[PDB]
Amino acid sequence: TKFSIYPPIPGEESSLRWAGKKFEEIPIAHIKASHNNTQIQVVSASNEPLAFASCGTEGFRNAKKGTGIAAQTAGIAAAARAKQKGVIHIRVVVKGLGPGRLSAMHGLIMGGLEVISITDNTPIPHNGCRPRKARKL
Amino acid sequence: AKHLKFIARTVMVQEGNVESAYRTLNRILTMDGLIEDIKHRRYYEKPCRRRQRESYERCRRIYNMEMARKINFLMRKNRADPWQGC
Amino acid sequence: NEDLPISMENPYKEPLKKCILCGKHVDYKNVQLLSQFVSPFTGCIYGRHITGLCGKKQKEITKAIKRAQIMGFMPVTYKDPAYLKDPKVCNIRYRE
Amino acid sequence: VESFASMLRHSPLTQMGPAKDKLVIGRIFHIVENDLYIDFGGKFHCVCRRPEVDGEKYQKGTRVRLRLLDLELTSRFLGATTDTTVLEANAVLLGIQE
Amino acid sequence: AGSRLETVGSIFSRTRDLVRAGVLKEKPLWFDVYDAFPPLREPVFQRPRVRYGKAKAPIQDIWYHEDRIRAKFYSVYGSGQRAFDLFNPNFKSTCQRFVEKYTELQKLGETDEEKLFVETGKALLAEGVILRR
RNA sequence: CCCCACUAUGCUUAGCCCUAAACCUCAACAGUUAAAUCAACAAAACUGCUCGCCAGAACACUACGAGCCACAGCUUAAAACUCAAA
Numbered sequence: 001t002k003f004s005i006y007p008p009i010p011g012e013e014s015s016l017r018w019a020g021k022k023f024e025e026i027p028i029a030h031i032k033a034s035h036n037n038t039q040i041q042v043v044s045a046s047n048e049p050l051a052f053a054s055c056g057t058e059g060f061r062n063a064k065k066g067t068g069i070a071a072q073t074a075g076i077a078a079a080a081r082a083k084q085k086g087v088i089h090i091r092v093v094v095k096g097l098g099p100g101r102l103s104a105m106h107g108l109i110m111g112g113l114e115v116i117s118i119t120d121n122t123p124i125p126h127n128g129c130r131p132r133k134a135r136k137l
Numbered sequence: 138a139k140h141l142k143f144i145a146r147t148v149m150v151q152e153g154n155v156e157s158a159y160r161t162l163n164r165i166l167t168m169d170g171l172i173e174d175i176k177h178r179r180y181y182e183k184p185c186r187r188r189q190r191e192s193y194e195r196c197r198r199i200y201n202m203e204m205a206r207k208i209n210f211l212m213r214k215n216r217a218d219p220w221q222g223c
Numbered sequence: 224n225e226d227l228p229i230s231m232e233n234p235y236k237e238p239l240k241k242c243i244l245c246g247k248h249v250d251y252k253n254v255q256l257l258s259q260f261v262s263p264f265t266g267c268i269y270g271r272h273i274t275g276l277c278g279k280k281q282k283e284i285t286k287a288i289k290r291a292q293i294m295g296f297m298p299v300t301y302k303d304p305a306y307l308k309d310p311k312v313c314n315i316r317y318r319e
Numbered sequence: 320v321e322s323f324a325s326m327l328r329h330s331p332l333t334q335m336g337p338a339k340d341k342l343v344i345g346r347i348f349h350i351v352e353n354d355l356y357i358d359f360g361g362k363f364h365c366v367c368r369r370p371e372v373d374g375e376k377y378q379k380g381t382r383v384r385l386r387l388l389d390l391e392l393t394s395r396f397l398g399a400t401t402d403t404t405v406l407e408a409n410a411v412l413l414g415i416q417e
Numbered sequence: 418a419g420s421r422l423e424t425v426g427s428i429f430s431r432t433r434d435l436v437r438a439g440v441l442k443e444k445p446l447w448f449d450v451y452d453a454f455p456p457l458r459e460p461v462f463q464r465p466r467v468r469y470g471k472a473k474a475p476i477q478d479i480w481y482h483e484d485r486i487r488a489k490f491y492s493v494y495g496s497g498q499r500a501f502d503l504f505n506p507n508f509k510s511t512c513q514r515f516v517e518k519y520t521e522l523q524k525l526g527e528t529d530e531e532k533l534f535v536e537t538g539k540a541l542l543a544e545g546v547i548l549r550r
Numbered sequence: 551c552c553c554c555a556c557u558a559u560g561c562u563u564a565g566c567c568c569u570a571a572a573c574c575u576c577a578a579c580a581g582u583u584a585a586a587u588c589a590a591c592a593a594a595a596c597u598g599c600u601c602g603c604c605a606g607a608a609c610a611c612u613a614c615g616a617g618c619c620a621c622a623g624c625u626u627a628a629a630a631c632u633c634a635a636a
């Protein structure tokens with residue numbers, strides 16, 4: 001059967017299973033990659049928070065938060081605290097284009113969780129709020 | 138917000154190749170213009186500057202395609218000289 | 224002299240090229256057709272350099288897509304998964 | 320006496336009409352390594368690559384079958400009042416004339 | 418020596434004026450030949466002009482009646498599988514034979530374009546020329 | 551100038567104010583591509599007809615007068631002295 005990049009539809013039945021569970025039952029790792037900090041929160045399919053870790057909660061301070069190593073450490077900590085609640089497979093939802101966008105997932109993988117899908121949900125307004133002025137540096 | 142989740146901007150991983158899935162998602166977001174839109178929306182671009190930039194890119198593209206067409210058209214003559222010596 | 228050339232419109236003039244939707248009606252309720260010109264992952268409307276449509280039909284498709292989206296017929300942020308297996312008419316590849 | 324108008328009207332080139340996708344017979348008159356210069360009766364010759372199949376058979380004076388695409392390759396470029404010409408025809412080499 | 422103003426008059430006019438003015442002692446070797454057998458146009462320099470507005474070149478497109486028939490043939494039966502031999506001054510293509518038969522039928526019958534086409538096809542098939550639509 | 555916070559203001563309604571590199575820096579209509587095309591550059595060169603405007607620089611998007619829902623405002627807009635330039 002040809003592999004499909006497109007996620008399974010909850011309505012249409014599919015044979016894809018991960019440890020006996022369907023796609024819409026897998027826990028979700030929400031990564032927020034800001035410019036100066038990265039946040040990782042693992043939740044269940046029913047939105048029950050299982051684990052949380054950020055670069056600031058792992059001791060990094062000021063500009064050290066906005067680095068790849070800090071995001072990797074936060075991902076490792078979140079993966080550990082989630083594995084302590086029975087999480088193996090996760091669906092990744094990344095938000096933002098910060099330096100920890102990929103390092104957080106690297107940490108999550110290195111912590112023992114298996115990624116089955118990657119989703120981007122960065123806020124893209126269709127021209128809503130007016131952004132701030134450009135810096136004159 | 139009011140849409141179904143895990144349908145938009147979503148890529149499934151094949152055989153545990155997470156890096157490949159991420160690079161494919163990056164290609165998709167860049168091709169659909171989402172990445173440049175996000176990067177441009179960080180600060181406000183004035184309407185006059187936006188119009189100038191759009192005109193500049195349009196004319197740049199037109200000129201580049203025309204020059205490429207000219208070079209490809211004149212590339213046919215670049216072969217071994219058939220009348221060497223004379 | 225009978226062999227002299229005669230004034231005449233070009234008989235070998237090839238028929239002028241047509242877009243795939245020429246002569247067909249674009250309706251906002253035909254979500255299946257309108258879904259063939261949007262990105263599967265973001266729902267963004269493809270430009271004419273990708274769709275290959277003429278300006279008139281490009282405008283028609285754009286207006287129909289916006290009308291269907293605002294009237295509760297078409298999703299905005301993604302292509303409806305039911306139309307993911309329809310014929311591909313857009314010149315775009317994600318190597319996916 | 321036959322006038323020029325009659326000659327043009329009854330010329331094979333005139334009778335051929337449009338030159339696109341027309342099968343013609345050409346003759347090899349010059350060879351430069353694997354480049355074959357073929358005259359098919361037009362104003363310009365066409366330069367073809369020696370086929371990988373029975374390439375040895377393609378020698379000077381050989382009769383070949385061609386599919387004409389353009390009698391002369393020209394193109395007007397940006398900022399030019401006159402077309403730029405390569406002084407060659409465009410054709411595809413099909414094979415040798417049995 | 419003569420004047421080098423190639424943009425004023427022609428070589429003949431300049432040489433003639435300089436000879437009559439006494440600047441040139443003797444006429445050049447070509448002057449008498451030019452005077453006896455002049456060209457159709459005096460070779461005077463002119464700057465080519467780009468056309469604008471409704472000004473158009475007077476060059477006409479070369480068309481014949483049979484071209485229509487040819488077009489329809491090339492649109493119906495397509496390009497003949499037989500190849501053209503442009504080196505032969507009297508080459509006859511399948512389309513040319515179709516044209517000749519069409520004209521003979523027109524001169525020996527009525528004028529109905531579709532009927533002429535169909536009957537011409539029947540006649541060519543009767544003669545034994547393959548014609549795949 | 552960089553970071554944070556927050557006003558007038560950007561928004562709607564009813565009135566004002568009447569200014570912009572308000573520029574394609576090309577006045578409106580009609581016509582021509584023939585002449586040496588043509589100072590230069592910009593944006594190929596011209597013709598007919600009409601309205602508006604301009605006659606060295608600066609003084610001066612100024613002073614005075616007049617008009618204006620404008621009162622540190624807008625339109626129109628000089629002169630004296632000075633210079634051989636601009």
Ligand code: FES
Nearest residue numbers: 241242245277280
């Ligand atoms: S080409 Fe005719 S409607 Fe698009």
Ligand SMILES: [K+]
Nearest residue numbers: 571573574575
């Ligand atoms: K301007």
Ligand SMILES: [Mg+2]
Nearest residue numbers: 570571572573
């Ligand atoms: Mg403006």
Ligand SMILES: [Mg+2]
Nearest residue numbers: 577578601602
């Ligand atoms: Mg006026």
Ligand SMILES: [Mg+2]
Nearest residue numbers: 577601602603
């Ligand atoms: Mg006026």
Ligand SMILES: [Mg+2]
Nearest residue numbers: 605606607608
């Ligand atoms: Mg003055």
Ligand SMILES: [Mg+2]
Nearest residue numbers: 611612624627
């Ligand atoms: Mg004033």
